[PDB]
């Protein structure tokens, strides 16, 4: 059942030829769930003249408010306070008696009436609580919302096809009236993966303004609505409706003669996706208590929160987040920040850095050497968890459960070929060792995008690195080159699939045309690609498992108070960086789950906490969704 | 210039199969002048640990030292201290004697011995070093960094197809080593631009492990050298050359009884570049003065300066960036950060803040209302770089010379539904709006990418925007996101050229395999393409025009700086705040020469000078090139 809406006439001489659109492809869960689907509607807009009086504007809305019902959930305190005053303004002017003299005394001028009559209204705005009041008064504030020439919208909802032929004509009767019918997107998950899902181009915009050239130099004309944002945009591709195309011929009369199908419609195709929208509406839960968990135990400057969760063995998505600008915890979401947005990421990345540290012959797997508080000719480094003294022994798995920063730095030394001594100078130039330790950390995701079907990725900031050691450090913490959740979860992902760094999708498969059936058949299947393995033995590959458990499971592990254990084991990695808002601190957390076979990894990124250590922990988030997908 | 290299053999059942390898492309500036060449070079590696020690591998350094000579930029200071057990009792017998009891009485280990010596060894003593001990160094560095079983490179030997011969004796003869002939980039015009031209992967490496699936999808074999980063990666296809391909039958005894060619092989395609590299070498130097012209007024840590030029069509004649430290002074290339890294701009931003504003007609084309320091609620805040005086009949081509806060301010609200009114609220969701300015942004190239042809283009920071208005005016100023000097210039040239936004490409033309020098027939041309023109009206866009030819000529800012010379240019600055390093401010700069039929564009971008006051001819950078191009 593809219906179509015409959209284009044009005539050259005898020829006409009539273009009509067709419905787009509907986008489903990984289980067939309905995200988005189509609707017919009929939009009837408002067209203000340059010279309409509001006396003419309320008797169109009074016959319009005859014609069809509104929802009177936008009118304003004010909306209300005025029209009182429109339509009782005897009433109105008894309560200003003395101001209607200082009106035309020379005294006050209208600006200060206004606002005073304003004030003197309460248990009257009740009487056009008349809700057939309230309807006109819904459709006129709509007619004053915009501009003297531009078609004011007043309502776009679900029309049926006779019914258009009923009303459309009496409604284009009323002066500024106009009815179209249009192609709109209805989403029955309501506001859950707006972001991600985006939007396709408006009637009234035919392909948006900056993307002319992208979509005429494949054949689009300029009137055709395309998807303009994320997946409507990303796979334009197949959900595009292919438009009916006809030439008619006329005799001079304007008889039609002749009539040939130019190209017939065709629906676009339905693409399912790898997300599961039950785990995604509880991860937005959980991901809100959590947030909130916090009872502003100080992080009301906290700004952003962020989760990523996968498949670790199929790169497929089930993952969103929330920006919560605190000075109120009134939040958007910020949805496609997993995977457009750059943070200081911390101590996550040191599973990347041993690999990188083993691939280039640095250390050796298994190796035990010692940290302590680190001497140079003015920088003292001390490890995050003393600072003083302690000299204590360590391997690389127990280097990670403790997230030390100072067996990072030995490593970074190791791969400089210059080892510390105390009191050494910090090497001057370090432009081949960080890029021996950036060509590792790109070999897990880390710092090179993670190729997931959605436009707008970053790879994160990458600043030159010659002779600045500081930040060569800092690099093998993680708090030099910014990350991205997503590349977070690439990375952790291929730890847990020994090795396999895997091009994660929420694209799942693409089908065909449908107006009725909950899928066609299959058209294509969309695959994690393979991207490399890293560049490792099978033994310095669990090693970095082995570490990532003991940081979680192990009591001296800083994991242990959030993941320490619960419905099924999470290997992972603490992240800790400081930075700038004033300074707050960055908080990461990364896992995985479960051990043995694993079936699902995340990531977790807190922006700017006012945080010291000693108290905070949001990987409560990731033990909360892991609790609930394993039950 | 000409020749191949052996690179694959393969036998089974009496038919080998030579694959020879074949010089990439060069690449060229706009004229014809050669940037990457190429060089036959041989390659000397030394591949022993099993056998050996150490004595002996400084014995064969040293044997090795005599035939060939090594540049000794590489030798570290760690390297020449460890290098010091040439000098025999003069580190143990003479500096270290209280630290040979304790070792003796077991108060001190060995490895607080190596800690202790390594401490005491200045660089005066490093001085004891010989010019040919730093030979032997240099050389032995790399064989000591040797993966025990695994060859490590030495030398890539300037040699003769017809030297190779005499020289290629050590088989291991020299016990280690091995050799090899290679083809290699080289580089007239040496470190200028390297960024940008790239690299071509290792003979070792093949396809970099990164880079798996993305060549392997492309019928490459693991062996292949490929183009790892920028141009190089970019022109790939058109840059590689067709292997030759041998075909032959042996016979058990080993003599070729048949033979066939399958490819003779074929340099790869020559890529000219619209870059001009007198134009390129000069900024760089008028880069270095004028921020070391700005190195005596505070800039302790400006950190980053970057510049971009190009006509509006043919894109990329200039691009040359800069980071340092401290002003310790260090300047390392950085290119690539015109196009790759996002900064906080400022004020340029409002020609397209104003263009939004006609666009949504919030703003008619010659629009009147005036500054004030105005307030809203909280109980406080106001605006426009002063708090008192009240400005008065300004245009809205007189609010550019200005840079005034205050009409992008007043703009904003207007477009936002709600004009001000003093003590006004937060509009409280701003979603709309910010959406409509966004876009509006977008039509000139801020916020999306330009489309350039190189890699790892970022289209800036984009945070929501929706009921935090602490950020939406803010963005109507520059200061809530992110773009980058490349974006910039897009946009200053979109404005140039009548309102047509233009992609940049570095790449200007394509010239097929030709087999001795010069370079072949044109292949394909790499035009600028019209990616779209603002919906802004013809007069609306002369406005801008007219906004900006009095702006760097009568701000009575930019006016100190553009001071009319050769200059018949006009323009806009960034005047615009940071904090973050602890407070410092960015600095920026766009505009465009011969205004009559403009040629050149340009962008600049200075980040934390510490400086806010009016002063900082920074600007001057611009005044300094547009005399060079038009004399």
Same mark, same amino acid.
């Given at each position: 059942?593809?219906?179509?809406?015409?959209?284009?006439?044009?005539?050259?001489?005898?020829?006409?030829?009539?273009?009509?659109?067709?419905?787009?492809?509907?986008?489903?869960?990984?289980?067939?769930?309905?995200?988005?689907?189509?609707?017919?509607?009929?939009? *009837?807009?408002?067209?203000?003249?340059?010279?309409?009086?509001?006396?003419?504007?309320?008797?169109?809305?009074?016959?319009?408010?005859?014609?069809?019902?509104?929802?009177?959930?936008?009118?304003?305190?004010?909306?209300?306070?005025?029209?009182?005053?429109?339509?009782?303004?005897?009433?109105?002017?008894?309560?200003?008696?003395?101001?209607?003299?200082?009106?035309?005394?020379?005294?006050?001028?209208?600006?200060?009436?206004?606002?005073?009559?304003?004030?003197?209204?309460?248990?009257?705005?009740?009487?056009?609580?008349?809700?057939?009041?309230?309807?006109?008064?819904?459709?006129?504030?709509?007619?004053?919302?915009?501009? +003297?020439?531009?078609?004011?919208?007043?309502?776009?909802?679900?029309?049926?096809?006779?019914?258009?032929?009923?009303?459309?004509?009496?409604?284009?009767?009323?002066?500024?009236?106009?009815?179209?019918?249009?192609?709109?997107?209805?989403?029955?998950?309501?506001?859950?993966?707006?972001?991600?899902?985006?939007?396709?181009?408006?009637?009234?915009?035919?392909?948006?303004?900056?993307?002319?050239?992208?979509?005429?130099?494949?054949?689009?004309?300029?009137?055709?609505?395309?998807?303009?944002?994320?997946?409507?945009?990303?796979?334009?591709?197949? #959900?595009?409706?292919?438009?009916?195309?006809?030439?008619?011929?006329?005799?001079?009369?304007?008889?039609?003669?002749?009539?040939? +199908? #130019?190209?017939?419609?065709?629906?676009?195709?339905?693409?399912?996706?790898?997300?599961?929208?039950?785990?995604?509406?509880?991860?937005?839960?959980?991901?809100?208590?959590?947030?909130?968990?916090?009872?502003?135990?100080?992080?009301?400057?906290?700004?952003?929160?962020?989760?990523?969760?996968?498949?670790?063995?199929?790169?497929?998505?089930?993952?969103?987040?929330?920006?919560?600008?605190?000075?109120?915890?009134?939040?958007?979401?910020?949805? *496609?920040?997993?995977?457009?947005?750059?943070?200081?990421?911390?101590?996550?990345?040191?599973?990347?850095?041993?690999?990188?540290?083993?691939?280039?012959?640095?250390?050796?797997?298994?190796?035990?050497?010692?940290?302590?508080?680190?001497?140079?000719?003015?920088?003292?480094?001390?490890?995050?968890?003393?600072?003083?003294?302690?000299?204590?022994?360590?391997?690389?798995?127990?280097?990670?459960?403790?997230?030390?920063?100072?067996?990072?730095?030995?490593?970074?030394?190791?791969?400089?070929?210059?080892?510390?001594?105390?009191?050494?100078?910090?090497?001057?130039?370090?432009?081949?060792?960080?890029?021996?330790?950036?060509?590792?950390?790109?070999?897990?995701?880390?710092?090179?995008?993670?190729? *997931?079907?959605?436009?707008?990725?970053?790879?994160?900031?990458?600043?030159?690195?010659?002779?600045?050691?500081?930040?060569?450090?800092?690099?093998?913490?993680?708090?030099?080159?910014?990350?991205?959740?997503?590349?977070?979860?690439?990375?952790?992902?291929?730890?847990?699939?020994?090795?396999?760094?895997?091009?994660?999708?929420?694209?799942?498969?693409?089908?065909?045309?449908?107006?009725?059936?909950?899928?066609?058949? #299959?058209?294509?299947?969309?695959?994690?690609?393979? &991207?490399?393995?890293?560049?490792?033995?099978?033994?310095?590959?669990?090693?970095?498992?082995?570490?990532?458990?003991?940081?979680?499971?192990?009591?001296?592990?800083?994991?242990?108070?959030?993941?320490?254990?619960?419905?099924?084991?999470?290997?992972?990695?603490?992240?800790?960086?400081?930075?700038?808002?004033?300074?707050? +601190?960055?908080?990461?957390?990364?896992?995985?789950?479960?051990?043995?076979?694993?079936?699902?990894?995340?990531?977790?990124?807190?922006?700017?906490?006012?945080?010291?250590?000693?108290?905070?922990?949001?990987?409560? &988030?990731?033990?909360?969704?892991?609790?609930?997908?394993?039950?």
């Amino acid at each position: 059942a593809q219906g179509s809406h015409y959209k284009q006439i044009i005539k050259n001489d005898e020829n006409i030829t009539v273009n009509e659109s067709v419905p787009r492809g509907r986008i489903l869960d990984r289980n067939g769930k309905v995200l988005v689907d189509n609707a017919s509607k009929m939009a *009837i807009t408002y067209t203000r003249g340059r010279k309409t009086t509001q006396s003419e504007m309320l008797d169109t809305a009074e016959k319009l408010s005859k014609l069809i019902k509104m929802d009177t959930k936008k009118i304003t305190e004010r909306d209300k306070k005025d029209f009182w005053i429109q339509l009782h303004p005897k009433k109105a002017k008894a309560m200003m008696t003395k101001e209607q003299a200082m009106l035309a005394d020379g005294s006050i001028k209208q600006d200060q009436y206004d606002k005073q009559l304003l004030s003197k209204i309460r248990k009257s705005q009740l009487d056009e609580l008349s809700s057939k009041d309230l309807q006109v008064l819904a459709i006129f504030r709509e007619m004053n919302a915009g501009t +003297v020439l531009d078609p004011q919208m007043i309502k776009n909802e679900d029309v049926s096809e006779k019914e258009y032929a009923a009303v459309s004509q009496q409604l284009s009767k009323l002066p500024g009236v106009n009815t179209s019918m249009d192609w709109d997107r209805k989403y029955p998950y309501g506001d859950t993966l707006r972001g991600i899902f985006g939007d396709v181009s408006t009637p009234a915009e035919g392909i948006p303004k900056e993307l002319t050239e992208h979509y005429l130099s494949k054949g689009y004309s300029r009137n055709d609505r395309v998807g303009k944002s994320y997946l409507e945009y990303q796979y334009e591709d197949v #959900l595009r409706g292919k438009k009916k195309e006809m030439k008619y011929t006329t005799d001079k009369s304007g008889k039609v003669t002749s009539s040939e +199908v #130019l190209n017939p419609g065709a629906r676009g195709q339905d693409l399912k996706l790898t997300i599961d929208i039950d785990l995604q509406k509880e991860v937005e839960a959980l991901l809100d208590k959590q947030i909130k968990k916090l009872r502003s135990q100080g992080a009301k400057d906290m700004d952003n929160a962020m989760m990523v969760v996968q498949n670790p063995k199929n790169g497929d998505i089930l993952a969103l987040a929330g920006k919560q600008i605190n000075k109120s915890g009134k939040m958007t979401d910020y949805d *496609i920040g997993t995977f457009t947005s750059q943070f200081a990421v911390g101590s996550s990345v040191k599973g990347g850095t041993l690999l990188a540290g083993y691939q280039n012959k640095a250390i050796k797997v298994g190796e035990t050497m010692v940290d302590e508080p680190l001497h140079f000719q003015g920088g003292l480094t001390k490890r995050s968890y003393f600072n003083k003294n302690g000299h204590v022994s360590i391997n690389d798995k127990q280097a990670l459960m403790h997230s030390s920063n100072v067996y990072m730095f030995k490593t970074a030394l190791k791969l400089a070929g210059d080892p510390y001594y105390s009191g050494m100078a910090l090497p001057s130039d370090i432009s081949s060792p960080a890029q021996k330790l950036r060509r590792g950390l790109n070999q897990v995701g880390l710092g090179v995008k993670t190729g *997931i079907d959605l436009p707008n990725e970053t790879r994160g900031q990458i600043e030159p690195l010659t002779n600045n050691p500081g930040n060569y450090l800092d690099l093998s913490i993680g708090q030099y080159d910014t990350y991205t959740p997503l590349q977070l979860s690439q990375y952790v992902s291929t730890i847990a699939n020994d090795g396999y760094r895997i091009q994660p999708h929420i694209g799942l498969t693409i089908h065909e045309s449908t107006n009725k059936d909950e899928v066609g058949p #299959l058209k294509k299947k969309i695959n994690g690609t393979v &991207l490399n393995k890293v560049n490792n033995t099978e033994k310095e590959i669990k090693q970095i498992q082995e570490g990532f458990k003991m940081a979680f499971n192990d009591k001296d592990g800083t994991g242990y108070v959030s993941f320490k254990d619960t419905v099924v084991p999470t290997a992972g990695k603490t992240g800790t960086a400081e930075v700038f808002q004033e300074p707050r +601190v960055n908080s990461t957390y990364i896992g995985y789950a479960p051990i043995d076979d694993p079936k699902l990894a995340f990531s977790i990124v807190y922006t700017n906490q006012p945080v010291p250590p000693p108290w905070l922990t949001g990987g409560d &988030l990731g033990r909360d969704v892991i609790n609930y997908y394993f039950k």
